[PDB]
Amino acid sequence: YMILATIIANCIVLALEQHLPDGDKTPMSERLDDTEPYFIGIFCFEAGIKIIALGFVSYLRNGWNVMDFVVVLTGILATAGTDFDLRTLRAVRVLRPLKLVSGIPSLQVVLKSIMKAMVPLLQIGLLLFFAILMFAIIGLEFYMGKFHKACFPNSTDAEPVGDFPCGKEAPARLCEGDTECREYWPGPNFGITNFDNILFAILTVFQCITMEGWTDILYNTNDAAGNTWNWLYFIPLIII
Amino acid sequence: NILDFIVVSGALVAFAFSGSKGKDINTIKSLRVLRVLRPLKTIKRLPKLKAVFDCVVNSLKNVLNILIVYMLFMFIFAVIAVQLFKGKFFYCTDESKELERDCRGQYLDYEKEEVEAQPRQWKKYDFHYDNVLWALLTLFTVSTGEGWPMVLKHSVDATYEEQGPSPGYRMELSIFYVVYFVVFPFFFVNIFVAL
Amino acid sequence: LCVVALNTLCVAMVHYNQPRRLTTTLYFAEFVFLGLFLTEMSLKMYGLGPRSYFRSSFNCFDFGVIVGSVFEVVWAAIKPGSSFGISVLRALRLLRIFKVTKYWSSLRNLVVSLLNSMKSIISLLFLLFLFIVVFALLGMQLFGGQFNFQDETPTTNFDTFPAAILTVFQILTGEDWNAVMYHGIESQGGVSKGM
Amino acid sequence: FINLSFLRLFRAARLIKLLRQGYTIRILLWTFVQSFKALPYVCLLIAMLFFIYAIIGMQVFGNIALDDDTSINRHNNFRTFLQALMLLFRSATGEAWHEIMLSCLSNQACDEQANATECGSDFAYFYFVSFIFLCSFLMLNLFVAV
């Protein structure tokens, strides 16, 4: 119970943190940073008493004990690590709340019960992957490099008047006014949703099978290449 | 047969009023829209389609009671939200004015790098909780998950009965929405599916 | 049941900009209904007996609602202002209309099944919160204080713990998660080195 | 002349050729597809719901002005049957269906070529709310039926 109280206190301290841009720090964050050695020492003591009561490679037989050991090891390394490489080492602290799962066996039983149903789903996930790739390749063969043309005024400082792809005298969206469909513009969503290579295609197809913002990509393809056949790519992708 | 009668007589009247001037264009539009019942006549004409329709009806009847319980719970949440948020979804076109008597005249709008004079008008947000029907509509849209962060922002910024919004005035009220999401879209929808 | 229905009807007429006469009538009717329910609860408790009264799971809910209503009344008397919204919960007693139907056994066995599993549901609900708190802390470590690369910081940020956990909840509901993904990628820097 | 760029799909069809090795995946896919082909009349009912709602929306909201910056624009409108069906599918998945509902309510600037001066009604409140109820329910009835 005292160890569970320490874990709860550590969770409260991790919740009390505040982050500011450009290197600013609240004084309360400085106050809270001083509490790390106490938690690390208590966890090391609690993990040290179990090693002289279960041995090692049986204390370390349990996976929860392994997670506790890696948490305390990363904490110790962070305390003694003055070097610049600690960002990936300070991130282990987010697993400290999970320690209280190992301290309450009922939570472990409930977690085992909930994860018992995710084993048959894995095959489904494989199928899902097979779908995404199968569409991404198709999206790589039709929409690759189509969202980079845009309506630019007359080549002054590369400021696109609109945030939609255009077409050069085609059934696509013609530029309005005296602008031109010039080459290179990052893209619609900071240039993130496109089909430039297989990774971007995979990401956009996955973002499209969650029915979140797929109509925006449909409309971009419509105004970049004409709305005659684009639906035939996106309605099955939503349906399947 | 009643359905067929209404879809036949409905068009009849439209023809009767068609051989004249634009008499009661509202009724003309209503009778033209009533023409969409043409496909429904097939429901009884095809035995398989009637069978699947009866299966849908039986499925609805198997869950009408949980539907009633769900509607009662959603009505309770709508009344709670009306008590919490009624009158507090008003705003002025410029954020500097928080009262209706001040939201009058012109103001300087700084858009497209060109200051321009714009009317200062007291308006209301699209989705609010002024009465129980508006609250029910807003909570249905929240349950669908569409634009619920916007109503969450409007609820957090709400200050008083006749005041404008103040950013982050009541963050704790978000508990409400979180609780709502734990009940209707998470629990009730899943018990509908399971039933 | 008729008293409960009348209370539901009167509490459901509350809207914005209602006449003052309606406000005063509902203010007095709240006290009248609270007194009627208090007397009914005391009479039933004296008749059945304390242990027998609390034997039923439905009377415990009524007792809790009554004490919460008394707390709300005294709170609002000593500090006029916001309303917790507990006197509306009495409308749940209207569910007793299902007793006279033939669907009482089904509706009542579901609640008996639910109440038999308070431990499992609480454990499951606390395990879902535990993983939402782990992901919020991870997001705070990743994008903590790095969303000021534009005009203003968004409401969907990872600076504080409440903001991070609310952002994680919004992502879990699935609404506008792709926008948050784009914004976080831009925060980590461009489409080149931030993917 | 007529475009001939679809043939590039053919070499992308060889992925199904490696779907044989998923002995557990292949049987599951075949079973669910065969179940889907055994229930065509429920799909016909869903298609009829879409057809009826598309026709009603075409008649009632067809002549809203195509002004951009709103939810009824050059991409999402009721102008044609195909456009109405696309709008209905977008609402069925759920993208901004409440925004489309707000975009046609009784006070919309009306189309230039349209003969009327006031087009768009408050029927949308029912129109969109019932659809989200009906479509979903039918979908939930279809899924279980498989």
């Binding site: 945030d163 | - | 409401t155 | 910056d69």
Partner: peptide, 25 residues
């Protein structure tokens, strides 16, 4: 909040009416 046609950020939710589509309220 921002008026109709004004430049906005999707994640600000500060459009008076409608959503922030394609960077404009």
């Amino acid at each position: 909040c921002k008026g109709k046609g004004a430049k906005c950020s999707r994640l600000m939710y500060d459009c008076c009416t409608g959503s922030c589509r394609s960077g404009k309220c």
